[PDB]
Design a protein around this ligand. Structure first.
Ligand SMILES: Nc1ncnc2c1ncn2[C@@H]1O[C@H](COP(=O)(O)O)[C@@H](O)[C@H]1OP(=O)(O)O
Ligand SMILES: Nc1ncnc2c1ncn2[C@@H]1O[C@H](COP(=O)(O)O)[C@@H](O)[C@H]1OP(=O)(O)O
Lengths: 357, 357
């Protein structure tokens, strides 16, 4: 069996990582929970056992076979290269290593093969990207992809535990204490790292992450570049608008594509249904489409509202929904680990290609 | 001075029709509030005055100069033709007359000229369509419009008063009582007419109105058909995805367009700023963009996140927000009435062009 480590166990994603590891087929001899110095000493369950939380340091990875990181891009930049030096395979849920050519960026159903040439770090893509890739890969395979335009309806759990609490408290202040929404005080959303902060209660904020030089945010640009890397095609045009909405869990996405060849809608429905990790929920006559609340707690990516464009020959609209902390993060990460084990890729790496900080 | 009736005066829109009339420049000698049998005999304010609500009948429109209808489609179909026969000019908020060729479909900033040839009924377009028209008309006027793809983020007040109450209590049940969103009992949303009803609390429901035979909903197809009538151009390609989110008031829209000539973004921003009824809110360096919660209570239509597509040379993305019950309904309706008075168009129609039911 393996010794597995969760770095960032106490967080929103880390807690889903525990839940997914508990339900995993991965044979674990020893489980460790890692976090910052304040969390060290507290107890936290793995199945029925009590586990002690430990400080994350440069020396804390000896004897570790697999480490799942979800502790923000700062904790991965500092500590992940040391884990690799110690003989760990790191699966990173943060954005830091995602655009490194030495790091495979992986959704198991789409680009499992990229895992074979890993140099110790495997990047988990952005949650909004992952569900889109699940929904679109089966179409790409049969008919090609010319362009994607996507608008997202993203839940607040992606922004961390604090965002959930902020949202819930804003909603209770409006509903119980009768506070105008434009009078609410916010501390986190739209982006903890940015200068100004706005309420999300009864609102739709068209900022996720911070702004880049081209006036798209880092989230939208991650959707663009991560798509090109996962599907291994730099010629796919991707433009996105990323919006936060008053949902705790589950991202929804309105997706528009143009294929390389015309794709009969019923063949598209069938192709998406036949694809692992994607579930067709499309029966408009009985008002069946994917819904965020129904997706909560499930590993699948649910797709419906599939219909052709009213004017573009090759254009298709659809609606994609997934638990953002499961397939969007923790399940993707654990599925990567299960896949690493399937393929005999849980072993030390010989050449370190990631400078130590 | 005019005798003005409000049909549907007790509803969510009707309440905003009252507020817009209260703040109008229109010379009003007499106000009447019409609704159904169940509100008949109740009282309601116009400024300091008490106004007894009357049941709408076919003979209730004697003496009325202007009638603002917002009582659902069946009510406009049944009574508006009798109002016209009596000598009223009708501003209809509903969809029933929107596609009749004898009926101007008007957003005053875009197509006020079409008021001149009215035959006793002017249709106010759909809420989500109006704000899109205000944002794009200044772009269309300078550079043309080849196509529109739009994804909406729509508030629940457009589904009426019962929908608002249903949203509020669903959220209260989740937040105060511990009820899981899965276990919520809905009666109205996503669409009061349809067979099945889903919770909107912490959800995103990709259905507004009922489905049509092409798998687009009636709401999505209205964006399409109204856009073409208002811009007097059937060659403008339009496809929509209309989604309800947990907001009480203020629609937001992620809008993609392709223009006929390249439109430098700095010129597009300028042209939108110069357009009556459109306000440019675009300064990403200071995180400035339209937000539903800020738009509430304003007649204006707010436009930001303006940026060129990453690949398509004529493509442009933007974010458009407006109060759905103001510019999207009641202000548009009162602004139509003010425009009619401006142009001496408030007068009886001789020839009856609408069927009496
Ligand atoms: N420097 C750090 N070293 C290890 N873990 C960290 C560090 N900084 C933050 N974390 C962990 O990352 C997660 C933050 O995401 P979230 O806001 O959802 O909790 C937490 O588990 C947090 O642990 P801790 O609770 O000890 O601060
Ligand atoms: N048959 C009808 N005749 C006239 N008005 C109607 C009729 N049915 C509904 N209405 C009015 O349409 C508006 C519905 O608005 P909303 O959808 O926001 O509840 C209400 O003012 C309602 O009046 P009433 O209050 O008497 O039911």
């Amino acid at each position: 069996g393996y010794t597995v480590a969760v770095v960032g166990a106490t967080g929103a994603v880390g807690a889903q990582m525990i839940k997914m590891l508990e339900e995993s087929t991965l044979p674990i001899d020893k489980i460790r929970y890692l976090a910052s110095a304040r969390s060290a000493g507290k107890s936290l369950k793995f199945k029925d056992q009590d586990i002690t939380i430990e400080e994350t340091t440069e020396t804390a990875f000896e004897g570790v076979d697999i480490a799942l990181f979800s502790a923000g891009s700062s904790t991965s930049a500092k500590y992940a290269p040391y884990a690799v030096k110690a003989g760990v395979v790191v699966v990173d849920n943060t954005s830091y290593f995602r655009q490194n050519p030495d790091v495979p960026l992986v959704v198991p159903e789409v680009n499992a093969h990229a895992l074979d040439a890993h140099n110790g770090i495997i990047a988990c893509p952005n949650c909004s990207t992952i569900q889109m890739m699940v929904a679109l890969e089966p179409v790409r395979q049969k008919w090609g992809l010319d362009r994607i335009i996507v608008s997202t309806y993203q839940a607040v759990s992606g922004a961390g535990m604090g965002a959930i609490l902020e949202t819930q408290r804003e909603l209770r202040e409006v509903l119980n204490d009768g506070v105008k929404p434009c009078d609410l005080h916010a501390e986190i959303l739209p982006s903890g790292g940015d200068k100004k902060h706005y309420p999300i209660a009864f609102n739709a904020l068209p900022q996720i992450d911070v702004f880049t030089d081209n006036d798209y945010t880092y989230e939208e640009m991650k959707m663009t570049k991560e798509t090109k890397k996962i599907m291994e095609d730099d010629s796919i045009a991707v433009s996105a608008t990323c919006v936060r909405i008053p949902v705790l869990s589950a991202h929804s996405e309105s997706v528009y594509i143009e294929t390389k060849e015309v794709a009969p809608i019923e063949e598209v429905k069938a192709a998406i249904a036949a694809f692992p990790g994607a579930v067709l929920e499309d029966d408009v006559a009985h008002q069946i489409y994917p819904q965020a609340i129904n997706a909560v707690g499930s590993r699948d990516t649910f797709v419906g509202r599939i219909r052709k464009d009213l004017d573009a020959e090759k254009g298709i609209h659809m609606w994609v929904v997934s638990d953002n902390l499961l397939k969007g993060a923790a399940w993707n990460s654990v599925q990567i680990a299960e896949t690493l084990h399937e393929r005999g890729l849980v072993r030390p790496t010989a050449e370190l290609k990631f400078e130590l900080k």
